[PDB]
Design an enzyme around this catalytic site. Structure first.
Site, PDB file in Angstrom:
ATOM      1  N   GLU A  35     -18.076   0.166   2.586  1.00 39.40           N
ATOM      2  CA  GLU A  35     -16.958   0.960   3.096  1.00 39.40           C
ATOM      3  C   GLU A  35     -17.248   2.456   3.038  1.00 39.40           C
ATOM      4  O   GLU A  35     -16.898   3.190   3.970  1.00 39.40           O
ATOM      5  CB  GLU A  35     -15.681   0.652   2.311  1.00 39.40           C
ATOM      6  CG  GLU A  35     -15.121  -0.750   2.539  1.00 39.40           C
ATOM      7  CD  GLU A  35     -14.479  -0.916   3.915  1.00 39.40           C
ATOM      8  OE1 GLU A  35     -14.098  -2.058   4.247  1.00 39.40           O
ATOM      9  OE2 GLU A  35     -14.371   0.081   4.669  1.00 39.40           O
ATOM     10  N   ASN A  46      -9.277   6.129  12.596  1.00 39.40           N
ATOM     11  CA  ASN A  46      -9.139   4.869  13.315  1.00 39.40           C
ATOM     12  C   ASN A  46      -8.592   5.107  14.715  1.00 39.40           C
ATOM     13  O   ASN A  46      -8.022   6.159  15.022  1.00 39.40           O
ATOM     14  CB  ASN A  46      -8.222   3.899  12.568  1.00 39.40           C
ATOM     15  CG  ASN A  46      -8.718   3.582  11.172  1.00 39.40           C
ATOM     16  OD1 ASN A  46      -7.957   3.649  10.199  1.00 39.40           O
ATOM     17  ND2 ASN A  46      -9.993   3.233  11.062  1.00 39.40           N
ATOM     18  N   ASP A  48      -6.054   3.910  16.207  1.00 44.13           N
ATOM     19  CA  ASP A  48      -4.606   4.073  16.299  1.00 44.13           C
ATOM     20  C   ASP A  48      -4.118   5.408  15.748  1.00 44.13           C
ATOM     21  O   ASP A  48      -2.908   5.662  15.754  1.00 44.13           O
ATOM     22  CB  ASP A  48      -3.898   2.910  15.593  1.00 44.13           C
ATOM     23  CG  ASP A  48      -4.122   2.898  14.093  1.00 44.13           C
ATOM     24  OD1 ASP A  48      -4.885   3.742  13.578  1.00 44.13           O
ATOM     25  OD2 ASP A  48      -3.529   2.031  13.422  1.00 44.13           O
ATOM     26  N   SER A  50      -4.523   6.412  12.580  1.00 47.95           N
ATOM     27  CA  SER A  50      -4.547   6.414  11.133  1.00 47.95           C
ATOM     28  C   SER A  50      -5.941   6.822  10.645  1.00 47.95           C
ATOM     29  O   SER A  50      -6.889   6.971  11.419  1.00 47.95           O
ATOM     30  CB  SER A  50      -4.149   5.043  10.589  1.00 47.95           C
ATOM     31  OG  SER A  50      -5.090   4.062  10.987  1.00 47.95           O
ATOM     32  N   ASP A  52      -8.820   6.279   7.188  1.00 45.44           N
ATOM     33  CA  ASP A  52      -9.219   5.580   5.962  1.00 45.44           C
ATOM     34  C   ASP A  52      -9.773   6.569   4.937  1.00 45.44           C
ATOM     35  O   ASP A  52     -10.539   7.467   5.288  1.00 45.44           O
ATOM     36  CB  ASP A  52     -10.276   4.511   6.250  1.00 45.44           C
ATOM     37  CG  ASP A  52      -9.797   3.474   7.227  1.00 45.44           C
ATOM     38  OD1 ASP A  52      -8.594   3.153   7.202  1.00 45.44           O
ATOM     39  OD2 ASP A  52     -10.624   2.976   8.014  1.00 45.44           O
ATOM     40  N   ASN A  59      -6.189   2.707   4.064  1.00 48.03           N
ATOM     41  CA  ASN A  59      -5.688   3.184   5.349  1.00 48.03           C
ATOM     42  C   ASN A  59      -4.303   3.816   5.241  1.00 48.03           C
ATOM     43  O   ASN A  59      -3.414   3.294   4.563  1.00 48.03           O
ATOM     44  CB  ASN A  59      -5.634   2.023   6.343  1.00 48.03           C
ATOM     45  CG  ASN A  59      -5.167   2.458   7.706  1.00 48.03           C
ATOM     46  OD1 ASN A  59      -3.968   2.500   7.981  1.00 48.03           O
ATOM     47  ND2 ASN A  59      -6.112   2.785   8.574  1.00 48.03           N
ATOM     48  N   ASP A 101      -1.477  -8.697  -1.741  1.00 47.14           N
ATOM     49  CA  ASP A 101      -0.449  -8.771  -0.712  1.00 47.14           C
ATOM     50  C   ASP A 101      -0.535 -10.022   0.150  1.00 47.14           C
ATOM     51  O   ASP A 101       0.247 -10.154   1.096  1.00 47.14           O
ATOM     52  CB  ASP A 101      -0.486  -7.515   0.167  1.00 47.14           C
ATOM     53  CG  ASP A 101      -1.598  -7.534   1.206  1.00 47.14           C
ATOM     54  OD1 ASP A 101      -2.390  -8.501   1.274  1.00 47.14           O
ATOM     55  OD2 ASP A 101      -1.680  -6.548   1.965  1.00 47.14           O
TER      56      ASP A 101
END
Ligand SMILES: [Cl-]
Ligand code: NA
Ligand code: NA
Ligand code: NA
Ligand code: NA
Ligand code: NA
Length: 129
Positions: A35, A46, A48, A50, A52, A59, A101
């Protein structure tokens, strides 16, 4: 800060990630390698809009507030800049919420594509833990 492999393993172990939700330490070190290349200051934007952040590329769409991801949530209740610190506490505490989650470590695309189903214990081989 750019961590060494065993340095990061030791830090993650001290913060309780070894076997957290059943994921052995090598999984977390492998995910961090692909990562961020072990760099706490890593950021990536990203498609969209957003971004990271940090050693585990958490994110802003869901997990932290960076002031520029409209309609996003802040489920770890932290500014995203806190995820870039040389102290990995904030990243580790937020990662624990993410991995609990329901989707496990599949939330990390690089873990799913480059660590899942590999000999992840190689990532902590030779380390004094
Ligand atoms: Cl990938
Ligand atoms: Na630093
Ligand atoms: Na392991
Ligand atoms: Na980028
Ligand atoms: Na956000
Ligand atoms: Na640390």
């Amino acid at each position: 800060k750019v961590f060494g492999r065993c340095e990061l393993a030791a830090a993650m172990k001290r913060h309780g990630l070894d076997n957290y939700r059943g994921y052995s330490l090598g999984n977390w070190v492998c995910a961090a390698k692909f990562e961020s290349n072990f760099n706490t200051q890593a950021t990536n934007r990203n498609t969209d809009g957003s971004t990271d952040y940090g050693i585990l590329q958490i994110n802003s769409r869901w997990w932290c507030n960076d002031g520029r991801t409209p309609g996003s949530r802040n489920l770890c209740n932290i500014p995203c800049s806190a995820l870039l610190s040389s102290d990995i506490t904030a990243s580790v505490n937020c990662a624990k919420k993410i991995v609990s989650d329901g989707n496990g470590m599949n939330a990390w695309v690089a873990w799913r594509n480059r660590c899942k189903g590999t000999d992840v214990q190689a990532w902590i081989r030779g380390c004094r833990l």
